[PDB]
């Protein structure tokens, strides 16, 4: 029992946004449940596509004005699928200090408990800021591995990492570092390194291209669009993009360069958020019902937490610039993984539905704090608010790099609640909306 491994929320740094009052009984109700999830349940409930969203739903719902029972609502929904946490092999723990052992242990889902004990015990020594800036931002072998593993599994470790920095809870930061260390490899490091590779020789992008301009250039490149197959299934990123369209995707991804200025870093960070929302909202089929993509939304949810990192004064700006660059390049990969679906602006500009035809951010916050899900729909509307705010200082100055502007933000958030209400968790979203097969076999899609 250490002060780090205890999850204690404080009414001081509670929410990046801060546009909602938090019922104080939730904070005592949240910590009580956050501690259970911290020492009872496995982070990975399956080996593949397994993530313990219990903490993410409890935290994000809170920052949107959650009640007491609404916090219990998040724990009760995601515990029905939750599996117990492995034991801690103390031999691995004491051995994880040797650089040779830490690398050979990476990829062990069953060793998550051991990695958590290690990062917690190392945080009790040099602090949560020193651990991250030597296991993530350090440019040595373990860093250049753990850093890519934060983007693994649809940016789920880097979402865990961002929350622990938002509410300042080193126990959470320990989990994210352990989650990234016990993740199966998706070969996405091979894409990150190649993208920063020809970003050296190829010079110079005098006028940096908008990220949306690279999205269109991606879909036209048939080798990229043809890289994912419905037969690849879970290994669309491993045995598809990275496996077939590596050299080609890196050619598009490399052209996304963030100049090392702070306003420029804020500028391009918002560009990624407008693109992510544009991806989840404009991936609709003319003629069919509106429905969001399960992996396009994960590009959006994670965008909010990259605004957390660029504000941290304890990360180097090159690393802060590196986090947005690696973010934007891996998004163009996921856009192809879902099927590179066609994005037209008419669906988001012309969207109406009586249920939320006049709801505001607050009403959406309220209506989302009570609905039963894994927390995904909540995180969407939370990021779309942040995307609206962080883009506005720049929205008018470059209208060609921001496809989502002004009122489109609220529209997408409304579409997020409409298309997932009165639907089970399995049938809320679609998996791979760019694949015509994804809509055929599903009956609820019509």
Binding site for its own copies (CB under 8 A): 46, 48-49, 80-81, 194, 197-198, 200-207, 217, 221, 230-231, 233-234, 247-248, 251-252, 424-426, 431, 437, 440-441, 443
Angle at 76 between CA 73 and CA 79, to 5 degrees: 145
Q: Closer to its own copies by CB, 24 or 216: give it.
A: 216
The nearest distance, CB 109 to its own copies, in angstroms, is 14
CB of 167 closer than 8 Å to CB of 189: no
Q: Is 84 helix (H, G, I), strand (E, B) or coil?
A: strand
Q: Closer to its own copies by CB, 8 or 243: give it.
A: 243
- Location of structure tokens 């991804």: 253
Q: Per residue in 280-299, is it b (16+ CB within 10 Å) or e — as a string?
A: bbbbbbeeeeebbbbbbbbb
Q: Closer to its own copies by CB, 67 or 375: give it.
A: 375
Structural element, H or E, at residue 214: helix 211-220
Cα pseudo-dihedral 99, 104, 106, 107, rounded to 10:
180
Q: Closer to its own copies by CB, 131 or 191: give it.
A: 191
Query: How many angstroms separate the CA atoms of 405 and 345, rounded?
Result: 11
Q: Closer to its own copies by CB, 231 or 313: give it.
A: 231
Query: How many angstroms separate the CA atoms of 181 and 123, rounded?
Result: 16
Q: Is 289 helix (H, G, I), strand (E, B) or coil?
A: coil
* Full 3-state SS string of 241-255: HHHHCHHHHHHHHHC
Breaks in the chain follow which residues, C to N over 2.5 Å? none
The nearest distance, CB 252 to its own copies, in angstroms, is 7
Query: How many angstroms separate the CA atoms of 404 and 65, rounded?
Result: 26
Q: Closer to its own copies by CB, 255 or 303: give it.
A: 255
The nearest distance, CB 138 to its own copies, in angstroms, is 19
Q: Closer to its own copies by CB, 46 or 370: give it.
A: 46
Query: How many angstroms separate the CA atoms of 413 and 411, rounded?
Result: 5
The nearest distance, CB 256 to its own copies, in angstroms, is 14
The nearest distance, CB 383 to its own copies, in angstroms, is 22
């Amino acid at each position: 029992v250490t002060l780090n491994s205890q999850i204690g929320l404080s009414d001081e740094h509670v929410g990046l946004l801060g546009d909602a009052v938090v019922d104080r009984a939730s904070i005592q109700e949240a910590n009580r449940l956050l501690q259970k999830n911290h020492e009872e349940w496995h982070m990975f409930f399956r080996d593949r596509a397994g993530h313990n969203h219990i903490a993410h739903s409890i935290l994000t719902c809170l920052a949107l004005g959650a009640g007491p029972a609404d916090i219990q609502r998040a724990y009760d929904d995601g515990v029905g699928i939750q599996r117990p946490i492995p034991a801690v092999d103390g031999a691995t723990v004491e051995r994880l200090t040797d650089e040779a052992f830490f690398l050979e242990t990476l990829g062990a889902i069953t060793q998550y408990t051991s990695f958590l004990v290690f990062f917690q015990r190392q945080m009790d020594a040099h602090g949560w800021q020193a651990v991250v800036n030597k296991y993530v931002f350090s440019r040595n072998a373990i860093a250049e591995k753990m850093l890519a593993r934060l983007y693994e599994g649809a940016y789920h470790p880097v979402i865990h990492l961002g929350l622990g920095i938002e509410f300042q809870q080193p126990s959470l930061i320990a989990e994210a570092l352990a989650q990234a260390a016990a993740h199966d490899d998706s070969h996405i490091s091979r894409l990150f390194e190649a993208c920063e590779a020809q970003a050296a020789i190829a010079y110079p992008p005098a006028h940096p291209k908008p990220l949306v301009q690279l999205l269109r250039e991606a879909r036209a490149t048939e080798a990229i669009r043809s890289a994912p197959r419905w037969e690849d299934f879970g290994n669309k990123m491993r045995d598809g993009v990275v496996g077939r369209a590596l050299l080609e995707m890196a050619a598009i991804g490399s052209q996304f360069t963030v100049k090392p200025d702070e306003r420029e870093l804020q500028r391009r960070t918002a560009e990624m958020i407008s693109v992510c929302a544009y991806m989840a909202g404009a991936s609709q089929r003319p003629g069919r019902k509106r429905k969001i993509d399960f992996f396009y939304m994960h590009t959006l949810t994670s965008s909010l937490f990259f605004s957390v990192l660029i504000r941290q004064d304890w990360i180097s700006l090159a690393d802060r610039v590196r986090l947005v660059e690696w973010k934007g390049r891996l998004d163009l990969a996921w856009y192809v993984v879902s099927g590179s679906a066609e994005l037209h602006d008419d669906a988001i500009t012309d969207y109406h539905d009586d249920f939320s035809a006049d709801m505001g951010w607050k009403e959406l916050y309220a209506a989302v704090n009570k609905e039963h899900d894994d927390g995904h729909v909540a995180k969407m509307i939370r990021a779309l608010k942040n995307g609206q705010e962080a883009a506005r200082p720049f929205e008018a100055e470059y209208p060609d790099a921001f496809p989502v502007k002004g009122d489109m933000w609220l529209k997408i958030a409304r579409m997020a609640l409409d298309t997932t209400k009165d639907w089970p968790t399995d049938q809320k979203f679609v998996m791979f909306t760019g694949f015509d097969m994804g809509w055929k076999i599903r009956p609820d899609l019509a």
